[PDB]
RNA sequence: CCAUGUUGAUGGUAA
RNA sequence: UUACCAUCAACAUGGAAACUUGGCUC
């Protein structure tokens, strides 16, 4: 699963290798011949007999892990404390596995978390925050303490430790001081305490709150003893205020003396500079990221106790972050009409698209402009600018048919558009100037123009056209989107292998509408991957959706035949929006059932190459500049020692990230019949990342997944209905 | 505490 | 909704926990 395509690059991850020394990890069944009901008693029963086993016993209740050999059958005996029965524990061997085998992970992680606890770090949520090494700005009584999450996972290269920083901000005024401010200003502002995360400094707990009561238990005594006495036992705390109100969480009661508010204070948020000063600390370059990681590692290295509880199991962290070599995929060549160019070092070619002509640019001779009374001049200016820039892009635009809206009410907009569309019957496009952040009007316009009557339509908000010195850019982008929405073609990229049909899918999960689960589907119907065919499937049950997907695939193939006179031999499906857990299921059942529709056509044997693309990953990559770390260049692929051990996949950094750590994307290949080399699939996915006709530049996922998400969003959020058939021959949804 | 979605604010980038 | 990118907030959907020499409410 390795290949050579470009110049190597000496990267570095936020990963720390764990060296397993022995080969002794032994699973054991535990059972009891008399019945013991209490889990705690089973733990104690193991505890008293630990001498024979050793002190490295890890026990969850039914299976035991031990790094030293025992006899196959081990029989020990003891007495119960409750029933006084002769409890006879039996322990038996299970199997023998390598110390890095993906099955002994979930208690190795417990070992590491204990090692952190020995280093005096709190356990908020799932992160470790170090209180002492904190920075106090004190501008609004604010101290930010840092922290870093750390988890041990297994990859093809072995046991690695993924560690990454996350900063948390705290004040130094207690909530009691704020309550005193509320009292003196004059419980008027106690209402803001709702939804406020509160903290205990020593951090034995974190909390959230809903309301506060004033006189329930200020001077009272808690259940067994005085309030102050129990808080003295817990924290050894003396309370300044005797009549402190009491906070209510759900019913649990919390206190204001030790309750410190968290997050950015609401008044700070308004402050621009302050918010800018805080973002300076929160946001980190690779240099400070690596510095914090090295601080963690040195902290563990210096304490002998952390090392001893580590090395009881034979493990040992290294002294430096993992260093990997990954290759830089070569640069692509983007095609235009009469001209073509190799992309720049930052992977962005906005100027080239606008200066030079596009591939196909059908003329515009009949179009209608709908604006309200309050936007006369700007609208007119816009039209002039839209004419002035038309020539370089390579379009012929005639003056629009002006329509003046008497008001902003949506009925007038809809009625006027419908009337003009009906009478003329040749309006190739509708342009609407919306007067404000009016969502209902946008939805109504798109519905009228995409289901009831088939005209492509573009909307231009008044704010965007309002600003001169930026009108040229907005005119350029609006006109390019208009050209795309009419079946035009902006730019293209060569494909080296012959006779492929790239398909993509992605899903829109409804937040509230009973899981409609609209799924996009974009499949090329041209040899140059330039003309796209798009459908939408409105099916809620996951079992039922595959039937409609089969219908979609056969229809797409039929149109491919009817427009090219020869079916393709290879199919590549960039499935998306699939969780890691569902991946196996998608590889087992959904893919073969989707494949089974190919029996509808005779003597047709394709070769599918199915991917799954998940954007969210937690590994970062740093380029090794000689004196610090910098941000990795776009177009870097790594498949060594960080990829998984059952699939064939790779991590790709495609887009241009301005500052900080870079986040690649993961390409699981869950079926491969065409026998493509890893180099070929890697380069092909990088080529497909360049073919998004809305943002001139490089994107994260391949273009078909981006298009399917856009179509699903439009059809499920805006239209709530399937679009018309005649529009689906073009990229109507941009 | 996690994901999945939206809705905003702020700051960039785009002749 | 000109189009992308970050950061922070909210909401609505589903889940999970820390125990490990066994976290732990006050
Ligand atoms: Mg997608
Ligand atoms: Mg658009």
Helix (H) or strand (E) holding A463: helix A462-466
Phi, psi of A491 (to 5 degrees): -145, 165
- Asked whether residue A376 falls in the same domain as residue A499, the answer is no
Q: Which residues pair with A430 in a beta bridge?
A: A368, A457
Among A162, A165, A262, residue whose Cα is nearest residue A205: A262
Alpha-carbon distance A556 to A558, whole Å?
5
Active site residue A229: no
Near-strand B residues (CB closer than 7 A)? A 124-126, 197, 272, 275, 350-351, 354, 437, 439, 470, 472-474, 476-477, 507-511, 577, 579, 615-616, 658, 713, 717
Give the position of tokens 């390409």: A667
A667: helix, coil or strand?
strand
CB A669 within 8 A of CB A611: yes
Among A637, A635, A682, residue whose Cα is nearest residue A655: A635
Q: CA A555: distance to chain centroid?
A: 33
Ligand 1 centroid from CA A441, angstroms:
27
- Asked whether residue A388 falls in the same domain as residue A500, the answer is no
Alpha-carbon distance A526 to A340, whole Å?
20
| Per-residue DSSP letter, A583 | H
- Asked whether residue A472 falls in the same domain as residue A510, the answer is no
Structural biology method used: cryo-EM
- Asked whether residue A244 falls in the same domain as residue A365, the answer is no
- Asked whether residue A499 falls in the same domain as residue A448, the answer is no
Is the C-beta atom of A279 closer than 7 angstroms to strand C? yes
Q: Which two tokens stand for residue A84?
A: 């006084």
A566 is in which domain, residue-wise? 492-716
Residues 111-130 of A with CB under 7 A from strand C: 113-114, 117, 123, 126
Q: Which two tokens stand for residue A6?
A: 């470009």
Active site residue A576: yes
Alpha-carbon distance A76 to A705, whole Å?
60
Alpha-carbon distance A466 to A436, whole Å?
12
Rg of the Cα trace of chain A? 32
* Alpha-carbon distances of A407 from A436, A694, A706, rounded to whole Å: 13, 32, 37
- Asked whether residue A467 falls in the same domain as residue A503, the answer is no
CB A327 within 8 A of CB A7: yes
A593: helix, coil or strand?
helix
CA A555-A558-A561 angle, 5° bins: 155
* Alpha-carbon distances of A81 from A40, A44, A61, A76, A499, rounded to whole Å: 12, 11, 18, 16, 76
Chain B bases having any atom below 7 Å from a protein CB: 1-8, 10-12, 14-15
Q: Which residues pair with A532 in a beta bridge?
A: A524
Q: What is the resolution of this structure in A?
A: 3.4
A617: helix, coil or strand?
coil
Chain C bases having any atom below 7 Å from a protein CB: 1-13, 18-26
Neighbours of A609 (CB within 10 A): 23
Ligand 1 centroid from CA A575, angstroms:
8
Among A386, A387, A427, residue whose Cα is nearest residue A403: A427
- Asked whether residue A509 falls in the same domain as residue A421, the answer is no
Ligand having the closest approach to the CA of A732: 2
Active site residue A506: yes
Neighbours of A267 (CB within 10 A): 9
| Residues contacting A3, CB < 8 A, separation 6+ | A677, A678, A679, A682
- Asked whether residue A647 falls in the same domain as residue A591, the answer is yes
Alpha-carbon distance A134 to A116, whole Å?
18
Q: How far is the CA of A660 from the C1' of B6 (A)?
A: 27
- Asked whether residue A509 falls in the same domain as residue A611, the answer is yes
- Asked whether residue A497 falls in the same domain as residue A595, the answer is yes
CA atoms A538, A542, A546, A549: torsion sign: positive
A475: helix, coil or strand?
helix
Among A65, A88, A87, residue whose Cα is nearest residue A75: A88
User: Is residue A61 left, alpha or beta, with left meaning phi > 0 and alpha meaning psi from -120 to 50?
Assistant: left
- Asked whether residue A502 falls in the same domain as residue A526, the answer is yes
- Asked whether residue A710 falls in the same domain as residue A621, the answer is yes
Q: Which two tokens stand for residue A282?
A: 């929160």
Strands, sheet with A333-335, edge to edge from the N-terminal-most edge strand: A340-342, A333-335, A492-493
What are the CB-based long-range contacts (under 8 Å, 24+) for A264-272? A264/A169, A265/A140, A265/A142, A265/A171, A266/A192, A267/A140, A268/A140, A268/A142, A271/A140
Residues before each break in chain A (C–N > 2.5 Å)? Answer: 186, 224, 250
């Amino acid at each position: 699963k390795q290949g050579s395509k470009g110049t190597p690059q000496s990267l570095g991850l936020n990963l720390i290798k764990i060296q397993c020394h022995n080969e002794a990890v032994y699973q054991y069944h535990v059972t009891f011949s008399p019945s013991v009901e209490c889990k705690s008693m089973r733990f104690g029963m193991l505890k008293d007999h630990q001498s024979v086993t050793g002190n490295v016993t890890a026990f969850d209740g039914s299976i035991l892990y031990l790094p030293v050999k025992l006899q196959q059958v081990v029989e020990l005996k003891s007495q119960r404390k409750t029933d006084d029965a002769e409890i006879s524990i039996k322990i038996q061997l299970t199997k023998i596995l390598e110390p890095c085998s993906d099955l002994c992970i979930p208690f190795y992680n417990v070992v590491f978390r204990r090692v952190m606890k020995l280093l005096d770090m709190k356990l908020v949520g799932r992160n470790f925050y170090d209180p002492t090494s904190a920075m106090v700005l004190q501008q609004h009584r604010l101290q930010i303490w840092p922290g870093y999450a750390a988890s041990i996972r297994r990859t093809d290269g072995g046991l690695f430790l993924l560690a990454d920083v996350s900063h948390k901000v705290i004040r130094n005024d207690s909530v009691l001081d704020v309550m005193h401010a509320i009292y003196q200003q004059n419980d008027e502002c106690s209402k803001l305490l709702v939804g406020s995360i509160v903290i205990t400094r020593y951090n034995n707990r974190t909390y959230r709150i809903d309301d506060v009561d004033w006189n329930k238990t200020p001077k009272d005594s808690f259940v067994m003893i005085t309030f102050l006495e129990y808080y003295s036992k817990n924290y050894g705390i003396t309370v300044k205020e005797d009549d402190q109100p009491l906070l209510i969480h759900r019913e649990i009661l919390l206190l204001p003396e030790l309750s410190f508010m968290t997050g950015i204070p609401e008044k700070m948020k308004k402050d621009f500079r302050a918010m800018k000063d805080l973002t300076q600390q929160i946001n980190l370059s690779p240099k400070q990221h690596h510095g914090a990681l090295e601080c963690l590692l040195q902290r563990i290295s210096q304490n002998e106790t952390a090392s001893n509880e580590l090395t009881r199991w034979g493990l040992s962290l290294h002294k430096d972050v993992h260093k990997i070599e990954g290759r830089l995929l070569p640069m692509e060549r983007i095609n235009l009409r009469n001209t073509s160019f190799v992309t720049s070092e930052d992977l962005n070619w906005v100027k080239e698209v606008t200066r030079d002509a596009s591939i196909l640019t059908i003329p515009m001779h009949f179009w209608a402009l709908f604006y309200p009374k309050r936007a006369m001049d700007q609208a007119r200016e816009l039209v002039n600018m839209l004419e002035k820039i038309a020539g370089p892009i390579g379009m012929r635009i005639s003056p629009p048919a002006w329509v003046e809206l008497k008001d902003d009410r949506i009925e007038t907009y809809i009625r006027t558009i419908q009337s003009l569309l009906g009478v003329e019957g040749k309006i190739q496009m509708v342009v609407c100037i919306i007067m404000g952040t009016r969502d209902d009007l946008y939805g109504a316009i798109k519905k009228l123009c995409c289901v009831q009557s088939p005209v492509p339509s573009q909307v231009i908000n008044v704010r965007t056209i309002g600003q001169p010195t930026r009108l040229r850019s907005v005119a350029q982008k609006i006109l390019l989107q208009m050209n795309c929405k009419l079946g035009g073609e902006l730019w293209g990229v060569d494909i080296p292998l012959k006779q492929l049909m790239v398909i993509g899918m992605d899903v829109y999960h409804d937040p509230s509408r009973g899981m409609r689960s609209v799924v996009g589907f974009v499949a090329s119907i041209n040899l140059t991957l330039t003309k796209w065919y798009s459908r939408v499937v409105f099916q809620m049950p996951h079992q039922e959706i595959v039937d409609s997907l089969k219908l979609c695939l056969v229809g797409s193939l039929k149109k491919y035949y009817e427009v090219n006179h020869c079916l393709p031999e290879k199919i590549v499906v960039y499935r998306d929006g699939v969780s890691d857990g569902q991946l196996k299921t998608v590889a087992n059942y959904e893919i073969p059932q989707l494949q089974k529709c190919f029996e509808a056509f005779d003597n047709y044997h394709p070769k599918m190459v199915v991917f799954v693309v998940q954007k969210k990953i937690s590994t970062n990559l740093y380029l090794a500049a000689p004196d610090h770390f910098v941000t990795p260049s776009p177009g870097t692929v790594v498949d060594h020692t960080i990829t998984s051990c059952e699939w064939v996949d790779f991590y790709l950094l495609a887009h241009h990230v301005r500052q900080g750590c870079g986040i690649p994307t993961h390409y699981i290949c869950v079926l491969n019949t065409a026998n493509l080399s890893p180099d070929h699939m890697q380069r092909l996915t990088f080529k497909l990342c360049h073919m998004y006709w809305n943002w001139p530049g490089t994107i994260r996922v391949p273009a078909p997944c981006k298009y399917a998400h856009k179509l699903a969003f439009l059809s499920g959020q805006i239209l709530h209905h399937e679009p018309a058939i005649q529009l689906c021959g073009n990229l109507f949804f941009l």
